[PDB]
Amino acid sequence: MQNHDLESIKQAALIEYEVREQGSSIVLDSNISKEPLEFIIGTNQIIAGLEKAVLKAQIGEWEEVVIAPEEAYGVYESSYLQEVPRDQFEGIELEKGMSVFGQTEDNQTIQAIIKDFSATHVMVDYNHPLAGKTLAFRFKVLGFREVSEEE
Q: Where do the segments described as IF-chaperone lie?
């Protein structure tokens, strides 16, 4: 029960995006300086992290969505094994594929997943700074317009 037009007709939704690093002034790529990108309502050909963002962004409103490296292009993963002595675990039982914890000297405790375990040594998955990092995909919905196959 609404007195509005028949929204059944397809439209050209223009958007613009810029992929920058967090904190750093450098830029990786941009289309904003080049020219905008039109698509039809429903054709989310963009990255999956931005697909869940574009539905929440309104017309004329800037939005900034930080995405992980494994959630954009996946070139350099953050999953590496580390050999740890069972001396660190003498009072706490272990298994393949459990969430384990590790108290650092920095008065903190990281969380990780065990890949293999024996009575001699244990092999735990951790991250490393040689991997990728988080990036800021900024974008805006420029807006949708009706278009025709003539002009």
A: 81-125
Distance between CA atoms of residues 38 and 48, nearest Å: 18
Structure determination technique employed: NMR
**What is the residue extent of each domain of the chain?**
1-75+133-151, 76-132
76-132 placed in CATH 1.10.1060.10: no
Helix (H) or strand (E) holding 18: strand 12-21
Nearest to 126 by CA among 149, 101, 143: 101
- Could you give the CA distance from residue 57 to residue 9 in angstroms, rounded to a whole number? 21
CA–CA dist 134, 22 (Å, integer): 7
Query: Which residues does 1 contact at the CB level (< 8 Å), separation at least 6?
Result: none
CA pair distance 67, 49, nearest whole angstrom = 7
